[PDB]
Design a binder for these strands. Structure first.
Ligand SMILES: [Mg+2]
Ligand SMILES: [Mg+2]
Ligand SMILES: [Mg+2]
Ligand SMILES: [Mg+2]
Ligand SMILES: [Mg+2]
Ligand SMILES: [Mg+2]
Ligand SMILES: [Mg+2]
Ligand SMILES: [Mg+2]
Ligand SMILES: [Mg+2]
Ligand SMILES: [Mg+2]
Ligand SMILES: [Mg+2]
Ligand SMILES: [Mg+2]
Ligand SMILES: [Mg+2]
Ligand SMILES: [Mg+2]
Ligand SMILES: [Mg+2]
Ligand SMILES: [Mg+2]
Ligand SMILES: [Mg+2]
Ligand SMILES: [Mg+2]
Lengths: 88, 109, 98, 95, 111, 243, 46, 236
RNA sequence: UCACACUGACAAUUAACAGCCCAAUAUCUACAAUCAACCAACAAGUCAUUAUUACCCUCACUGUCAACCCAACACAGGCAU
RNA sequence: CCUUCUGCAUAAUGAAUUAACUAGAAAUAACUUUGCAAGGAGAGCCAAAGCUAAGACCCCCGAAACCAGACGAGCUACCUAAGAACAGCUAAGAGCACACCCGUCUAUGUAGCAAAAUAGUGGGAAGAUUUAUAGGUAGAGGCGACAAACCUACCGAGCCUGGU
RNA sequence: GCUAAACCUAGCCCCAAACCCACUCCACCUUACUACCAGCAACCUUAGCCAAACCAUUUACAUAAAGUAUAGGCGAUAGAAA
């Protein structure tokens, strides 16, 4: 890593880039290494990368579930601290 | 009819059984008449040196001292290899046609 | 009349984006990225060709560009050639007697 | 191109928030249409020698069909603007 | 190595090198008494036949003649209090055969 | 457990988040403007008030637009301020009858225009209202330059306007070589616009297109740290010797 | 006849009728997989 | 759904093409024609309807010769290979079209009539009045688009200026240009209408499912209609 | 523990059988099989290649067990070559 | 015992006990008592003794059934491609008869072997025949040698989701 | 006395407050957890149950003005601003 940083200043040996799949979640797409370019590969052309608008509802639902889990954990920690204070 | 059963080569039919397979890592290819071609260039060659007169051993002695941990960084390597910078009072910027390119992982391990 | 159905033939390419008909700005497309996207106009890539040669992946030259090409409409015969007439055709092509 | 009127009348919703419509408000009523109307003859000045129907440098009430098919595309006339009008006035005064 | 991307050899590329091997190997006792000069080996999944041949010839210099590998299936008929299946780790097995009739015997321990 | 902002503010939140924040200021201002459209499918009441019958008393009224539809053909072809009206109608214009849905459509044509700023003929599916507007504007270029963003509603028209603005701002030889007088006269014919080149690029571009342009602009691959370290060492040597 | 035996197992037909490719070709399967992931099931599809 | 029609061939060929049965289904999968599907396998034979067609580096009239007369399972009219020059092709077999017979394929419209035989093909501008013809073309260089079935025959009526009023077998007149190509004689395989199917086995083998079992009520359209002959359909 | 196929470790099942498979350009296969020669017939039928360019390294991977599959059961039931 | 109904042990339904869960949320107005009064209430509302504030009053389970999109031809109906099967005997969409396809009838079974089984008498068994593999036809639909039959055990139109 | 009976702590609901997560190593749109080679993909008035004892037009998505105007098979109902 030090040699690579001093030779080109590039992070992470394996190259890559961020992309948006169908689910919409920002996934770090991994390069598979090919021989032919991308503007003519039949298989890679099928691997589209877009989430479309209707997935916004599912994204909002996932965000709400995560927020609910976080609030539950926060209330749990608060109740634990309150019980600990009550014990002493 | 099992969702928890991880799909593998011991499940599907002959076609998918022979197609998928375990981590085989294609080393060659087929030539029409079911005649596989073993590319000598794609076959790995374990570069094992001679272990003659080796000083160290796979186990250390507790009597040895203890030193602090300091992950090596780029700044330290640059400060170490600072001969021409001081002599000013050689570098490989572009390495696209190099043997073992750095940024594009072309060398194994 | 002509053979070959349109549906079976190669599908007609899509219509070129109208942004290219505005001589002349920088048509922003997804060429910078490396994946198909609905929005953003479609780019136009150049003709790519491999440098080194490959045995299994080799494209021969056209029918005219060759190291030797004769214009005389020659004809060759082999075992698979099934004549029509038979004896008379062979006698004519050989100039012999039966 | 097709004028349309609303049914049930909007119940008014001030000016800040948008007017919350309803499924009944979707109903419409055709009141009038742009087409099916007596057309008008736009004014166009000619730039070259045209048939007896017109004269060089003489604004006339030309029809829309011809003005859009032959005159304007071929540059034989120009819209009744103030700039070209002043240019034609100067050309006439130059006589 | 294992679990590492390999450099795709196009056509006029250099010979593939493998420095600092990752995967390992280990022999076991014959199951139903194998023939003479026939050593067994438990190889992981990411490993072929010529791979093991070169591995041995380079590390232990054992004159390996022929090799015949195969994959074994792990048990899975067992459930805990949660009623969840447990699939044991799978592994590949090989049957290396020495050359020159060296005649090797599996040594025993715990006398 | 609840959110911090409403549901109709996530758009602005994302716009102010990161990459959308680095965008220019004029683009964000034009996007946030959101002006009202021009009346087309409804008589716009001039006076704000109107004395309704059955009672001589003034009342406040407004003009609500008609939820118009914009199919892809409207964005691909220069269409006026009209489109596909999606609504419902009774039988004989009486609520006492049945209710049935209805969808109107405009009248399309195929004319051949010729713009002087671009010097090229096109074949666009123009309508009658668009032709009337072009005739009233005393030129297709004037009609394209007068209609703002949300008033023209069409990606092709926005691209044409952006190209015309870029051409008027560049003021370089390109129109008619070996004819500087003609180019000068053409530029003089249109002088009430000419947006600067900095603001002329972000004209009509969509959100995704603008983000892509911004990404391509400030790309800049990671510079090797070797040059930075060499510069730091040079600065250190300077501070040690000179100063 | 015996109506308690209708299942004819076949990995080919199973994966062709309920496969990741078939579930991602159309937006229907996309929404199905999204709802499944939202529910929290272990297996998303065969 | 995935449905690629077998009709996919560029260059004309003599070998039988592997025919893929349809079954009254469209590209989607739904049935559009009741009574089709389930029969005997068949191999399509590429036929060349355009009789007159000069081969490469040719233009003037050419001669041909019949070699064999075979049966065609696709249509009801038998066919017969006819080679000529330096190529071969299939064409409709006319009545009394024995093998080893020479056939002419002219085109130059002569001044006077031409006593055409039974196999030769000449344009309508050189055919006597009142002569049976078949494989009539709708326009010059179009191809046989009408008479072609077995036992069919088109009698010539008259000519006007530069056209010819043809009388189809259904008593429906039609006028076409006089410079178009046509064929004399009638199609072979005579007496095909009298073919006794005998049993349902042959009908099922031919590839035709039976009719539905619904007892439909004969509407008003099930009455005897005596309409007059329609007007002459021209194509000038 | 009807007595145990129940609970934890042991290791199997090693390819030669089958799968994993074809470089391009113009280009062409009229006489079915039925002991196919006598006898022929209708439902008209499953199997082929020509010239040029470039190609020379060769044994990699998967399946291999059982009293076994689908029927809530250890099921007089259903299953092709 | 409870409920119904003019009428009950009635032979009208409910019920084996035990532990847990389980079925009246409030309204213009009205009644009682507090505080001030032609005024009170912490803007707004009511005033020919009025208002403010408090107290007190509006049950549960139960269908058939519709909408929009998913899931469904691995069994059933049809179609498509390439394959497989049909002893023998008498002698042609011929006849008997193996395998094989379906089950007109008896008997057993009826919480059984089976949420559709066991034997023969049964029709065919070189042809409108059966079947191994894959793909296509999905409900306002598909298919249908019409049985208005089938479309995953219940299809006069299968289930789910959200309106319910 | 066999069978039984109780423990209460992990965690849950409300808002009160901030706006959240997201690549160590290989693998994942072809048959998902498959190192490898020549071709179209986007924007759509929601319906319906129910109440008028049926049901078609109809039926909902800080305070005061005000449940007023107004609309409504002018009946069941709906219902704003200055
Ligand atoms: Mg059962
Ligand atoms: Mg076995
Ligand atoms: Mg009671
Ligand atoms: Mg009661
Ligand atoms: Mg009573
Ligand atoms: Mg009783
Ligand atoms: Mg009083
Ligand atoms: Mg089936
Ligand atoms: Mg049937
Ligand atoms: Mg009976
Ligand atoms: Mg009984
Ligand atoms: Mg019968
Ligand atoms: Mg029989
Ligand atoms: Mg028999
Ligand atoms: Mg239903
Ligand atoms: Mg109700
Ligand atoms: Mg009602
Ligand atoms: Mg207000």
């Amino acid at each position: 890593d030090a040699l690579r940083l001093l030779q080109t200043g590039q992070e992470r040996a394996r190259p890559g880039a961020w992309r948006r799949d169908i689910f919409g979640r920002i996934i770090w797409h991994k390069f598979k290494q090919w021989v032919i370019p991308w503007h003519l590969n039949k298989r890679y052309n099928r691997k589209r990368f877009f989430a479309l608008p209707y997935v916004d509802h599912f994204l909002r639902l996932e965000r709400e579930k995560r927020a609910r889990i976080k609030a539950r954990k926060e209330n749990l920690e608060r109740k634990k601290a309150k019980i600990l204070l009550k014990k002493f | 009819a099992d969702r928890m059963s991880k799909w593998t080569s011991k499940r599907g039919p002959r076609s998918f059984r022979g197609r998928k397979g375990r981590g085989a890592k294609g080393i060659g290819f087929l030539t029409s008449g079911w005649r596989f071609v073993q590319i000598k260039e794609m076959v790995p060659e374990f570069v094992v040196p001679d272990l003659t007169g080796f000083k160290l051993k796979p186990y250390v002695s507790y009597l040895a001292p203890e030193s602090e941990e300091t992950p090596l960084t780029a700044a330290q390597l640059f400060s170490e290899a600072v001969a021409p910078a001081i002599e000013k009072d050689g570098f490989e910027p572009t390495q696209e046609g190099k043997l073992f390119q750095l940024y594009p992982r072309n060398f194994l391990r | 009349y002509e053979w070959g159905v349109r549906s079976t033939r190669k599908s007609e390419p899509p219509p070129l984006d109208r942004v290219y008909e505005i001589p002349g700005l920088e048509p922003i497309t997804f060429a910078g990225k490396m994946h198909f996207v609905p929005w953003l106009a479609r780019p136009i890539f150049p003709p790519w060709d491999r440098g080194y040669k490959d045995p299994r992946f080799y494209r021969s030259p056209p029918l005219h560009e060759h190291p030797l090409y004769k214009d005389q409409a020659c004809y060759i015969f082999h075992h698979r050639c099934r004549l029509l007439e038979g004896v008379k055709q062979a006698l004519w092509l050989t100039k012999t007697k039966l | 191109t097709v004028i349309v009127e609303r049914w049930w009348k909007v119940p008014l919703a001030g000016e800040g928030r948008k007017p919350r419509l309803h499924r009944r408000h979707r109903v419409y009523k055709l009141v009038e249409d742009t087409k099916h109307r007596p057309k008008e003859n736009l004014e166009l000045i000619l730039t070259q020698s045209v048939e007896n129907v017109g004269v060089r440098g003489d604004l006339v009430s030309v029809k829309k069909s011809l003005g859009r098919n032959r005159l304007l595309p071929q540059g034989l006339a120009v819209y009744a603007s103030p700039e070209n009008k002043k240019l034609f006035e100067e050309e006439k005064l130059l006589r | 190595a294992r679990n590492v991307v390999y450099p795709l050899y196009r056509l006029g590329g250099p010979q593939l090198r493998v420095f600092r091997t990752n995967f390992f190997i280990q022999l076991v006792r014959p199951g139903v008494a194998q023939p003479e000069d026939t050593v067994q080996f438990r190889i992981p999944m990411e490993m072929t036949r010529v791979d093991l041949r070169n591995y041995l010839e380079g590390i232990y210099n054992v004159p390996v003649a022929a090799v015949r590998t195969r994959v074994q299936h792990g048990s899975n008929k067992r459930r805990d209090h949660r009623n969840v299946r447990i699939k044991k780790p799978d592994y590949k097995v090989a049957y290396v055969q020495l050359a020159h009739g060296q005649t090797f015997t599996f040594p025993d321990l715990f006398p | 457990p609840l959110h911090k902002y409403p549901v109709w503010l996530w758009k602005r939140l994302q716009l102010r988040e990161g990459i959308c924040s680095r965008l220019p200021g004029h683009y964000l201002r034009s996007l946030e403007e959101e002006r009202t459209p021009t009346p087309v499918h409804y008589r716009p009441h001039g006076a704000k008030f109107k004395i309704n019958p059955k009672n001589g008393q003034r009342e406040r009224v407004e003009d609500v637009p008609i939820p118009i539809y914009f199919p892809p053909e409207s964005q691909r072809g220069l269409w006026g301020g009209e489109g596909w009206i999606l609504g419902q109608i009774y039988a004989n214009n009486d609520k006492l009858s049945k209710r049935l849905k209805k969808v109107w459509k405009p009248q399309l044509f195929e004319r051949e225009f010729y713009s002087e700023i671009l010097d090229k003929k096109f074949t666009v599916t123009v309508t009658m209202r668009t032709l009337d507007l072009i005739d009233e504007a005393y030129g297709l270029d004037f009609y394209i330059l007068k209609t703002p963003k949300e008033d023209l509603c069409s990606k092709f028209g926005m691209d044409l306007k952006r190209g015309m603005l870029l051409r008027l701002a560049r003021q370089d030889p390109q129109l008619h070589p070996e004819d500087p007088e003609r180019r000068a006269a053409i530029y003089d014919k249109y002088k009430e616009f000419a947006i600067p080149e900095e603001e002329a690029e972000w004209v009509g571009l969509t959100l995704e297109e603008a983000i892509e342009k911004q990404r391509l602009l400030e790309e800049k691959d990671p510079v090797p740290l070797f040059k930075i370290y060499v510069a730091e060492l040079i600065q250190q040597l300077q501070q040690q010797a000179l100063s | 006849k015996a109506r308690g035996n209708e299942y004819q197992p076949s990995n080919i037909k199973r994966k062709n009728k309920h496969g990741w490719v078939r579930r991602l070709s159309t937006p229907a399967g996309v929404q199905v997989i999204l709802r499944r992931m939202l529910k929290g099931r272990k297996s998303l599809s065969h | 759904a995935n449905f690629v029609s077998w009709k996919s061939r560029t260059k004309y060929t003599i070998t039988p093409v592997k025919m893929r049965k349809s079954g009254g289904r469209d590209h989607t999968g739904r049935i559009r024609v009741h009574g089709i599907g389930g029969g005997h396998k068949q191999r399509y034979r590429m036929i060349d309807f355009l009789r007159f067609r000069p081969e490469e580096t040719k233009s003037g009239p050419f001669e041909e010769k019949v070699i064999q007369v075979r049966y065609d399972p696709c249509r009801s009219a038998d066919i017969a290979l006819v080679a000529g020059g330096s190529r071969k092709r299939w064409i409709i077999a006319t009545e009394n079209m024995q093998a080893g017979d020479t056939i002419l394929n002219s085109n130059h419209i002569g001044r006077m009539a031409v006593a055409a035989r039974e196999g030769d093909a000449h344009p309508l501008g050189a055919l006597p009045v009142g002569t049976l013809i078949n494989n009539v073309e709708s326009e010059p260089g179009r191809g046989a688009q009408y008479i072609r079935a077995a036992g069919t025959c088109g009698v010539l009526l008259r000519k006007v200026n530069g056209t010819a009023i043809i009388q189809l077998p259904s008593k429906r007149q039609m006028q076409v240009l006089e410079t178009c190509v046509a064929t004399v004689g009638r199609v072979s395989n005579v007496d095909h209408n009298k073919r006794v199917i005998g049993k349902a086995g042959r009908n099922r083998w031919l590839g035709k499912r039976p009719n539905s079992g619904r007892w439909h009520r004969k509407g008003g359209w099930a009455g005897r209609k005596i309409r007059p002959l329609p007007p002459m359909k021209s194509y000038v």
